[PDB]
Structures are given as C-alpha cells and as structure tokens.
C-alpha cells in the first residue's frame, strides 16, 4: 500500500520526464512495422465500387527519446498511455473514400527501450470493385498504406509477415476470405531520388 | 451552512483530483453488467445488429477514498466521468463507433468505489438468420479491456442474466434469452490470462 503509492509516484514521475520530438528526419530516420488483423468485410457496394473493412492495424516503432533506465524509476519496464499523449506515425490508407472510423480506445504501450505498440481497431471504406464476388474465383481488391508526408528517408515501413492474420475473421460474415496479404513495396519516381514505401493490402473474397 | 456543504464538496473534489491505471503490482477488479433496452435493427444484408443498452461499470480505487469526518460527513459525490480514470472496456466485434445516449457521470463513494452507467447504441457483427422463426436468431459480442490482461484488470459480473426488466415491450424483436458470461482465455504463447464478458442474445421478430 505504501509500496503501491510509491509505484504510482515512480510512474507519474517517469511520464512527466518523458512527456516534458519533432518527428523523424533524414538524419534520424524511423522504422514503423505494420500488421493487419482482418475481422470482417462488412459491406461491398456494387453501385459505387466501395468496400468496407473492419480490422486491427498494429503499429510498432522505436524512439530513443522514450528510453529510460528501469533502475531509476522503481524497476518500471513499461506503461500504458493515451495515443494522444505521444507522437504517432501518420500511416494512411491511400485510396479510402470516407474518413476512417475508430472502433476502439487509442492507447499505446511504451517499453523502457523506447518501443511503442499501438493497435487501433478501424472501419475503412475504400475503392474496390466487387465484380466476381458471386463466383468461385471471387473478387480481388487492394489498398496501400503508408506515410502521407514522409518519404522512405524519414519513415521506413516493414511487415513481420506477409500473411494478414485471419484467425479472428467473422465466421458468419457475408463474405469469406480466399486470401489476404500485406506486402511492403518500394516505389521510385523520375524527378525525386528518395524512395516511397507503402504496405499493400490485397484481399480476395467471395460471397459465402 | 448550505455554502459549507458546497465548500466541503469542492474542497474534497479538488483535493482528490490533485492515478496512472492498473499495473501487475496494483491490479483492479472491474464489475460489468448489462441492462438491454432494445434490439433496434437487424440487417441481414451486412450481418450487423444494433443494440441499445446500459453498461454498468464498477471498480474501486484506494486513491479515491476519504474520511467523511474531514469533509462535513460527505459520503459520496457525482462527477463527470472525464475528471476521473475510467476502464477501457470495449466491444470486440463492433462495426461502428459506439454512440453514447446518456450523460457520462460517475458516483464516487468515500471508500473509493466508483459506479458509472452510460447508455449506448452498438452495431456489432451478427447473423440474424432464423430471426423470422420460432427458434429465433442467436448472436454474441465480447467485451473486455483493450490493453490490459487479467493480471491488471480482472473482469467480473454479479450475475450471468442480462437485466431485461426495462426491455422495450413493443420492440420489433422479442428477447428469448440474454446472458453475460465471464470467459477466461489462455493462449499457448503466454502465461497471463485474458478476460472478457460474452453477451449472448437469443431473439426473434
């Protein structure tokens, strides 16, 4: 109880020191790891060629400015914090047709080495032609995710796997998944020498 | 002296408000109960069902306790839920943002216990096949913390029967049964448990 108040004071003191970073730079680049858990294809609109996905978008990154020695803070190794209290990466779907809807709290976990884990649940409408969804071959759609304002020189993007996690896909959805993949891509343009990274989400699905 | 009651209350509130959430060393029990008001809509073209309910949430913090003798015998008070810490209990299979239908105001008592009962409309994943039959349709949604395991937030119910005493008698759907059951999940990777409350509603037109 005296020890419990002491751990609360260590934590408040730790957050205060950390919370009191201008984003990544070419000189101080950042790696963001993305993975998708696909929960449901809710809607597939043939009259507008939009499709609605519900998923978890797991984001991990590491900042030296969030590092701390556990010994100097009561052996605290990690803490939860509102995602709005720290910097977050501007990872964006490139072909949405509606503002994304947040379906969960937005809370990150910070570890003493500076690592941050952040998994918002989201609902996304994006451009997708569901032609074929009523056939054995099904339909195929794709959407790219990446930073909106940072090239690969400031934010590098990775995946830990190319398989979209489907182990929580809604078993009674109107649509079953034939395959779902998440692929890092490196793009180069004529003008600009800096590369652009995205993660391409490709989903193949048909009516159940 | 009515001013003195107000003075004691303002003093107490500013005192208490001037807690980082639970940890493995200081874990928290959150009790959860549902009062189901209405199944508003069951959409068989997208398999979403819309629910209106009250979500009763109760927990207890030592940092919120006080001696009524030091504060004019004030034994409890009301406060905006935004001025205190609240648990991150979430539907796991929603398809839209929760809509809040009521003020968000909690009651804190002198022993540090908190009660918070917001009304909510929730769209969640549900196949309403059979809702036009005697057997009806069955659907389910889990609620649990978003970032905490069972070692930081333990989730509990006082009963596994959903309170149906205020269920809208002229709803498009009648309730056959409604249960709220604590589940403990174990992953083979991981020694710590994960706790959810599974809400199962059997209903028909």
């Amino acid at each position: 109880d005296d020890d419990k108040l002491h751990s609360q004071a260590n934590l408040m003191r730790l957050k205060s020191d950390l919370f009191n970073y201008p984003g990544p730079t070419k000189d101080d680049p950042l790696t963001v790891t993305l993975g998708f858990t696909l929960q449901d294809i809710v809607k597939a609109d043939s009259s507008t060629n939009e499709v609605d996905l519900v998923y978890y978008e797991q984001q991990r990154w590491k900042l030296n400015s969030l590092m701390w020695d556990p010994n100097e803070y009561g052996n605290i190794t990690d803490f939860r914090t509102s995602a709005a209290d720290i910097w977050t990466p501007d990872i964006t779907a490139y072909s949405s047709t509606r503002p994304v809807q947040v379906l969960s709290p937005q809370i990150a976990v910070v570890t003493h080495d500076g690592s941050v884990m952040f998994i918002p649940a989201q609902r996304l409408s994006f451009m997708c032609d569901p032609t074929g969804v009523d056939s054995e071959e099904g339909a195929t759609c794709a959407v790219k995710f990446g930073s909106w304002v940072y090239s690969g020189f400031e934010i590098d993007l990775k995946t830990d796997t190319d398989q979209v996690d489907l182990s929580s896909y809604y078993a009674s959805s109107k649509y079953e998944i034939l395959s779902a993949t998440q692929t890092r891509q490196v793009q180069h343009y004529s003008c600009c020498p800096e590369p652009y990274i995205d993660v391409n989400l490709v989903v193949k699905f048909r009516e159940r | 002296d009515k001013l003195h009651s107000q003075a004691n209350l303002m003093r107490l509130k500013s005192d208490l408000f001037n807690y980082p959430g639970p940890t493995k060393d200081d874990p928290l029990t959150v009790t959860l109960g549902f009062t189901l008001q209405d199944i508003v809509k069951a959409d068989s073209s997208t398999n979403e069902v819309d629910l209106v309910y009250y979500e009763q949430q109760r927990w207890k913090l030592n940092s919120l306790m006080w001696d009524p003798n030091e504060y004019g015998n004030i034994t409890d008070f009301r406060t905006s839920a935004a001025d205190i810490w609240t648990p991150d209990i979430t539907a796991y299979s929603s398809t839209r943002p929760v809509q809040v239908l009521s003020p968000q105001i909690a009651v804190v008592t002198h022993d540090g216990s908190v009660m918070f009962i917001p009304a909510q409309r929730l769209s969640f994943m549900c196949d309403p096949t059979g809702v036009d039959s005697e057997e009806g349709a069955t659907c389910a949604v889990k609620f649990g913390s978003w970032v905490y395991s069972g070692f930081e937030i333990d989730l509990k119910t006082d009963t596994d029967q959903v309170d149906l005493s205020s269920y809208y008698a002229s709803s498009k759907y009648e309730i056959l049964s409604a249960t709220q059951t604590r589940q403990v999940q174990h992953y083979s990777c991981c020694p710590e448990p994960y706790i959810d409350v599974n809400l199962v509603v059997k209903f028909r037109e």
Binding site: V109, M117, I119 | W146, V147, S149, C190, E192
Partner: peptide, 16 residues
C-alpha cells in the same frame, strides 16, 4: 491466437 487479440498482441511485440 494471441496476435489477433489487441490486449495480448500489444503485450508481446517480440511475438506479434
């Protein structure tokens, strides 16, 4: 498994 559960995954970066 763990990695599709946001509370488990966020607690096991090395794994998820």
């Amino acid at each position: 498994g763990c990695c599709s559960h946001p509370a488990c995954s966020v607690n096991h970066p090395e794994l998820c």
